[PDB]
Write a structure and sequence with these properties.
Chain lengths: 335, 335
C-alpha cells in the first residue's frame, strides 16, 4: 500500500480559494478553477475536500479530516490523463450531486448516511477509466472484456470501478467509513456498489423505467429499496448533467467528451473493429447536432422525467437544458 | 508497475539443483526442495523456470527467457504467506499438470498452445489468495462478498485471480503471450480465464457432469470446446491432486490445508459467524478422518471418473489415491 505523503496533503491544503467560489452553488464553474490555479489537480482536490468537510457529514459519521483528504488523493491517483473521464469529471459529479441534494432538496428523500455515501461514491464511480467505453472492451477482445463475458457481467468498467473503490477503502488511512458501526459499514458498501453499477448506460432505459414506476406508484421514504432507487437515479443524473450546466460550461464538457470519443475511434480503426460515426474524427460531426441529440434522446429526456415526477426542486436543471437546446438549435440554423 | 530487478532474477538463476531432481516426474517432492534450500522461494521459482523453459514451449511461442522469469517472479510477489494457498501451491499445480500432460499423455488431447497456456495458468490461478474461501466473504459481509452479491458472480476469489493475472500480463516485461498473434492472444486469454474460473469448487458437480457428457458423446480433438473442457478438467485435477501424491507428501500437504482452514475458523470465531467442523481448531479432528472424507466424496470419485472416462494415462493417480485411503484407514484402525 502506497501511503499519501504530507507533501501531497499540504499541496491541497495550501490552495487558497480566497472565498471567491461557492462550491455549493449550481453556478460553480470547475473550468474556471482549473484555469486560475497553477496546480489544477490540487485545486480540484481542494474543491471536494472543502465541500465535503464543510457539509458536516464526514464529522457526523466519524471520518477524520486527514482520512477524507487521503481518500480524495487515493482516488485522484487512480484517474488517468484522458480527455473526459479524468479526476475533474468525478469532482464535477460530486459537486453536482451536492447541489441536487441540498439546493435541489433531494436530501429530503434520503437519510444523512445515504447522502454521505452518495457524495463519497461520486469520487470512486469512474476509477481507472482508460478513455474507452464498455463496448470497446468487448469488440476488441480485450482481456477485461473477455473476463467480463466469462464471468457473466456486461458492466465491464463499473465492476472494475467497484473493485478499486474497495481496494482504496481497505486502507485504514483512507477509510472514510472508519467511524461507522459494522452494520452501517456493510450497508454503506452495498449502497456505494449499487450506485456505481447503476451508472452503466446499458441499463439506462430500464433504470428510467423503474424510476418512473416508483414515482407513479408513490415514494415511501421508510422503504430502503425506494431510497436506493433514488440514490441510483441521482448519481445517474449527475453523470449526464453536463448538458444542464450554463451553456459555455456545457460546451467545454462537450469538447472534452468529443476528444475522448475520437481517441477511442482512433484505436478502433487500428484494431479493425466497427467505429460508430460519433467516434470517427474523419466524419466531421457537428457539435451542435450531437448535443441536441444527447439532449433529446438521453439527458434532456432523463432530467425532464425525473424532475417532473419526483425531484421537483431541481427545476433549474430542466430550464437550463431547454435553454441550451435552443442555443444549439440557433447555432444550427445559423450555419 | 514495479519492475523485477536483475538481482531478483540472479537470485533464482544462481540456484543449483545439480541432477538431484527430475521436475518432470510424478515423484518429484517439492517439500524436499523447500526444506533443503536456504532460499526456498527462489528455489521454487527455479523449479518452474527450469521446467517451463526446458519444455520448449516458451521458445516455440516466442516467449523470451527473461520474460518468463519476470512473469514467474511477478506471480510470486502476489502470493501471501498463508499456510496453503502460497506460492508453493501454484508451483506444485504447475509441476503436477506437466506430469499429467506428458507422463500422463494428456497432451495428446490438446494443441501445443493449449499445453503452454495451461502451464502458465497454473501460476496465476490463486493470485493474492488470503487464506479464506469464497464462503467466508459472504458470511462476514466483506466488501468483496457484497460486490459478488450485487454483480451476480459467486466466484469471489477466482474472478480476483483473473484480474491480477491480466494486470501482470499487461506488463511487456512479463507478458508470456508476447510472441502470440493477436488471434492467439485472445484465444490464450479466454483459455486462461476459463481455466481459473473452473477451479471454484462450488461448480465441481456441474464441471464433472459436463466432463462426463463429453465422454458420453465422444471426445473430438478437432472440437475447440472439447479441448477447452479438457483443459478445465486438468487444472481442476491438479488443484485437488494432493491426495494422489506419495503418502508422506500427501500428508504434508494435508497438514498445510488443515492449518489454513483452522486459521479461517479462528477468524470466523472472531467475527461471530458460524464455523464448520473442518475449520474448527478446537475440535482437534484426526487428519486421517478429514482426508478419508475428502477422498471418498470429492477427490476419489473425481480422479476415478476422469481417468476411467478419458485420461487413461493417469492411472497412477487413481492407484495412489486408493493406496493413500488405505493408509489413512490403517492409521485410524490402528488408533
Ligand atoms: C461521456 C458519456 C458517458 C456521457 N455523455 C456526455 O456526458 N455528453 C456530454 C455527451 O455529449 C454524450 N454523448 C454521448 N454520451 C455523452
Ligand atoms: C484447498 C481445498 C479447497 C481443496 N482441498 C484439498 O486440497 N485437500 C488436500 C483437502 O484435504 C481438502 N479438504 C477439503 N478441501 C480440500
Ligand atoms: Mg462510468
Ligand atoms: Mg483457488
Ligand atoms: Zn461518470
Ligand atoms: Zn489452487
Amino acid at each position: 500500500v502506497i501511503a499519501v505523503t504530507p507533501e501531497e496533503r499540504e499541496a491541497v491544503m495550501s490552495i487558497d480559494f480566497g472565498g471567491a467560489y461557492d462550491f455549493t452553488s449550481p453556478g460553480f464553474n470547475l473550468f474556471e478553477v482549473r484555469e486560475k490555479y497553477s496546480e489544477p489537480m490540487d485545486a480540484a482536490a481542494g474543491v471536494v475536500y472543502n465541500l465535503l468537510w464543510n457539509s458536516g457529514l464526514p464529522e457526523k459519521f466519524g471520518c477524520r479530516e486527514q482520512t477524507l483528504l487521503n481518500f480524495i488523493l487515493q482516488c485522484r491517483r487512480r484517474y488517468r490523463r484522458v480527455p473526459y473521464h479524468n479526476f475533474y469529471h468525478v469532482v464535477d459529479v460530486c459537486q453536482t450531486l451536492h447541489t441536487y441534494l441540498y439546493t435541489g432538496k433531494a436530501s429530503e428523500l434520503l437519510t444523512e448516511l445515504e447522502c454521505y455515501v452518495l457524495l463519497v461514491t461520486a469520487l470512486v464511480h469512474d476509477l481507472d477509466h482508460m478513455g474507452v467505453n464498455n463496448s470497446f472492451y468487448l469488440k476488441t477482445d480485450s482481456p477485461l472484456g473477455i473476463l467480463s463475458s466469462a464471468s457473466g457481467n456486461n458492466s465491464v468498467l463499473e465492476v472494475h470501478h467497484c473493485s478499486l473503490a474497495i481496494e482504496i477503502l481497505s486502507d485504514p488511512a483512507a477509510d472514510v467509513f472508519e467511524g461507522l458501526s459494522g452494520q452501517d459499514v456493510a450497508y454503506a458498501y452495498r449502497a456505494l456498489i449499487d450506485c456505481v453499477l447503476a451508472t452503466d448506460m446499458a441499463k439506462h432505459a430500464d433504470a428510467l423505467s423503474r424510476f418512473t414506476e416508483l414515482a407513479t406508484s408513490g415514494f415511501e421514504k421508510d422503504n430502503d429499496t425506494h431510497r436506493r432507487l433514488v440514490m441510483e437515479t441521482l448519481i445517474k443524473a449527475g453523470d449526464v448533467s453536463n448538458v444542464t450546466k450554463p451553456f459555455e460550461t456545457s460546451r467545454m464538457w462537450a469538447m472534452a467528451v468529443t476528444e475522448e470519443f475520437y481517441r477511442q475511434g482512433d484505436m478502433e480503426k487500428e484494431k479493425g473493429v466497427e467505429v460508430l460515426p460519433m467516434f470517427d474524427r474523419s466524419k466531421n460531426n457537428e457539435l451542435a447536432r450531437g448535443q441536441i441529440g444527447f439532449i433529446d434522446f438521453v439527458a434532456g429526456k432523463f432530467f425532464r422525467d425525473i424532475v417532473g415526477n419526483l425531484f421537483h426542486g431541481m427545476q433549474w436543471c430542466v430550464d437550463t437544458v431547454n435553454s441550451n437546446r435552443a442555443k444549439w438549435q440557433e447555432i444550427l440554423d445559423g450555419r
